[PDB]
Amino acid sequence: TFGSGEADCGLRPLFEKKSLEDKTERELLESYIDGR
Amino acid sequence: HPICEVSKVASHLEVNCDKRNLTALPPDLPKDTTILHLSENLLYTFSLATLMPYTRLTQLNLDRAELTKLQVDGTLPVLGTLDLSHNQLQSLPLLGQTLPALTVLDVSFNRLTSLPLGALRGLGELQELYLKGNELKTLPPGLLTPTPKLEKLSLANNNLTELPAGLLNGLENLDTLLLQENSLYTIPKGFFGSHLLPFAFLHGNPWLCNCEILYFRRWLQDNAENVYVWKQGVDVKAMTSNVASVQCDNSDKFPVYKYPGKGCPTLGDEGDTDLYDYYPEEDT
Amino acid sequence: IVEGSDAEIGMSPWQVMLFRKSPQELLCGASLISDRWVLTAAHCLLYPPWDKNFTENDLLVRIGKHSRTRYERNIEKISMLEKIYIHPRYNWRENLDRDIALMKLKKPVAFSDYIHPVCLPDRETAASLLQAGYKGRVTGWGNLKETWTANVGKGQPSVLQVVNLPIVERPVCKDSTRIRITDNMFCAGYKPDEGKRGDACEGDSGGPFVMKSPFNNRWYQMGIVSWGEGCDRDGKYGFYTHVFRLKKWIQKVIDQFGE
Numbered sequence: 128t129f130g131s132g133e134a135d136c137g138l139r140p141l142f143e144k145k146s147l148e149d150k151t152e153r154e155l156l157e158s159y160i161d162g163r
Numbered sequence: 164h165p166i167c168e169v170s171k172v173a174s175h176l177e178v179n180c181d182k183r184n185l186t187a188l189p190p191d192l193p194k195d196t197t198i199l200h201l202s203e204n205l206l207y208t209f210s211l212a213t214l215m216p217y218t219r220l221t222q223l224n225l226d227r228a229e230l231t232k233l234q235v236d237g238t239l240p241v242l243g244t245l246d247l248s249h250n251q252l253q254s255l256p257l258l259g260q261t262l263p264a265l266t267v268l269d270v271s272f273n274r275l276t277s278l279p280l281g282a283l284r285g286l287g288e289l290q291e292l293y294l295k296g297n298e299l300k301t302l303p304p305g306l307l308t309p310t311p312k313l314e315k316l317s318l319a320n321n322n323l324t325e326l327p328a329g330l331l332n333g334l335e336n337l338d339t340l341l342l343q344e345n346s347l348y349t350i351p352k353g354f355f356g357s358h359l360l361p362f363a364f365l366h367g368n369p370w371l372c373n374c375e376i377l378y379f380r381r382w383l384q385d386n387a388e389n390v391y392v393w394k395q396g397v398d399v400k401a402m403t404s405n406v407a408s409v410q411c412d413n414s415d416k417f418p419v420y421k422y423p424g425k426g427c428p429t430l431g432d433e434g435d436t437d438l439y440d441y442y443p444e445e446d447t
Numbered sequence: 448i449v450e451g452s453d454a455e456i457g458m459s460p461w462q463v464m465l466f467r468k469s470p471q472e473l474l475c476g477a478s479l480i481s482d483r484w485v486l487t488a489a490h491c492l493l494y495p496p497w498d499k500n501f502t503e504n505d506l507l508v509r510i511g512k513h514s515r516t517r518y519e520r521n522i523e524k525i526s527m528l529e530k531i532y533i534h535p536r537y538n539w540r541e542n543l544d545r546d547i548a549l550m551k552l553k554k555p556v557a558f559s560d561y562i563h564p565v566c567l568p569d570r571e572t573a574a575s576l577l578q579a580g581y582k583g584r585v586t587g588w589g590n591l592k593e594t595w596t597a598n599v600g601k602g603q604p605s606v607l608q609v610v611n612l613p614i615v616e617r618p619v620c621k622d623s624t625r626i627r628i629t630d631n632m633f634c635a636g637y638k639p640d641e642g643k644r645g646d647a648c649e650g651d652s653g654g655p656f657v658m659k660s661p662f663n664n665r666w667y668q669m670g671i672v673s674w675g676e677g678c679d680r681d682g683k684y685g686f687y688t689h690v691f692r693l694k695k696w697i698q699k700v701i702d703q704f705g706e
């Protein structure tokens with residue numbers, strides 16, 4: 128039942144946790160919008 | 164203060180009593196001293212209990228003060244670094260129960276010829292052990308058992324002839340191993356185990372290359388990029404690997420990583436790889 | 448990774464390096480999904496057609512790295528393998544269907560700024576993020592070009608590489624290769640008429656294809672670098688193991704024994 132690590136998964140100490148964004152993650156987010 | 168130099172910053176106090184012909188610790192120093200430099204004095208004998216106060220002392224330098232007797236009495240629950248190098252100790256001091264938060268111990272260049280039974284008992288936080296320049300001939304079995312967190316071990320320039328087959332047992336974080344300039348002729352069965360060793364110094368030894376130098380033979384092969392030649396400090400032994408520095412009989416041209424075991428048993432167990440060709444090409 | 452760029456420090460804290468003990472060599476990528484579980488591509492461990500069959504004792508796992516070859520002091524952590532689990536129906540004979548394997552670390556590893564686990568997608572997340580056009584991210588220390596044939600440039604990087612690629616619609620993936628595709632894989636990469644380039648390459652398998660959820664701001668691993676034909680060639684696409692579709696097998700081994 129227990130894995131040890133989740134619930135905290137996917138949140139990067141040097142980025143999300145510090146409210147900082149990496150240089151290209153914006154490219155990913157912009158692709159979630161219909162490009163026509 | 165009138166004898167040693169005092170400085171503060173970051174809240175840590177650092178007192179420097181180097182080269183002041185002291186035979187004992189000066190008249191009351193800052194109770195909040197963290198760093199204490201008592202190098203090059205005349206502390207033939209020294210009592211740790213004499214530092215009992217200064218409960219914020221983390222680094223203690225008693226090197227080059229020709230100490231032959233260290234009285235391990237009181238406790239320094241916050242002492243992390245302890246330099247005892249370049250002294251006259253003939254017996255390794257039992258710092259277990261006295262220095263629990265110790266992580267760096269340097270008893271290099273003393274007069275050690277052997278190590279106690281439970282020599283390091285109680286130093287579970289030890290990260291670096293320096294015993295270079297002594298005259299150890301053999302290391303006791305289980306010497307590093309109490310120090311599972313060890314990251315660096317220096318046993319260079321001693322009188323070691325053979326190492327305990329299970330010396331490196333545990334050591335999940337060992338990255339540096341210095342055994343250069345000793346009297347080593349071979350390496351036990353699985354001495355290096357499965358752990359990856361980033362920096363090893365094995366040069367300056369009379370390796371006897373026969374049939375039981377094969378384990379070490381292949382290890383060198385696999386770890387060709389992790390064998391370096393010690394030069395000095397500030398150099399950062401991360402400059403150009405050099406596996407060839409390990410030579411048979413210390414006989415220059417006879418690197419051990421190129422010794423065909425000619426007529427040696429089991430034609431496939433020790434050094435049985437080197438099966439395929441490779442053509443790597445990384446950059447700056 | 449071909450036509451990607453150097454990763455920022457801690458940009459992909461879940462990145463894992465599968466290291467061979469003897470001889471010492473990087474053999475594949477992988478990802479950390481918990482303090483004791485690592486996910487990779489099955490063929491990184493077992494591929495009979497090339498006589499490849501690696502056991503627990505033949506490998507080490509390096510976590511928290513950035514540089515490809517430099518040992519990184521109190522940054523990377525080196526762990527041993529307790530057990531290797533390859534999908535029982537991994538198809539190495541024809542197309543690497545179900546190219547996945549789980550690795551159980553001998554001891555749990557502590558997280559840090561450089562070491563942190565990635566999330567595994569849930570029903571809604573999968574259905575929501577896996578759409579053609581949507582971009583994911585692939586990371587790895589694999590080849591920078593096709594190295595089996597003369598080509599200009601360095602073969603491998605000195606630092607971890609990263610590239611963002613669009614998911615491709617199945618029909619397009621299917622008609623770009625003669626190899627038989629399954630629902631257990633997907634492909635990504637820029638089409639001939641999009642201009643931008645980028646792809647995984649040899650040495651990148653096991654590496655993760657990740658996407659950030661606009662909903663909870665978490666990173667999820669949607670794929671595992673599995674295969675391709677050449678690297679970054681026009682009209683060709685990199686193929687990845689579809690993690691969500693194998694979710695049931697993953698949970699079953701993960702939660703199989705106590706802890």
Ligand SMILES: *[C@@H]1O[C@H](CO)[C@@H](O[C@@H]2O[C@H](CO)[C@@H](O[C@H]3O[C@H](CO[C@H]4O[C@H](CO)[C@@H](O)[C@H](O)[C@@H]4O)[C@@H](O)[C@H](O[C@H]4O[C@H](CO)[C@@H](O)[C@H](O)[C@@H]4O)[C@@H]3O)[C@H](O)[C@H]2NC(C)=O)[C@H](O)[C@H]1NC(C)=O
Nearest residue numbers: 492493494495496498499500501502503504505531533539
């Ligand atoms: C990938 O490679 C692996 C090794 O690199 C392969 O595993 C190895 O397979 C061989 C068989 O070819 C194993 O042989 C020895 O073990 C078997 C028993 O097998 C079971 O018990 C082992 C533990 O004792 C496990 O390790 C096995 O996984 C398995 O559970 C014995 O029967 C053999 O004995 C034979 O040889 C001795 C002399 O050496 C004779 O005295 C006997 O009479 C008999 O003839 C071996 O002792 C080997 O142990 C095993 N090693 C490992 C790490 O598993 C693996 O099969 C391969 N995978 C694929 C898909 O190809």
Ligand SMILES: *[C@@H]1O[C@H](CO)[C@@H](O)[C@H](O)[C@H]1NC(C)=O
Nearest residue numbers: 276297298299300321322323
């Ligand atoms: C250790 O080696 C040194 C260097 O040759 C030598 O002078 C010394 O006598 C040796 N010590 C012992 C105990 O033999």
Ligand SMILES: [Cl-]
Nearest residue numbers: 649650651652
């Ligand atoms: Cl490959």
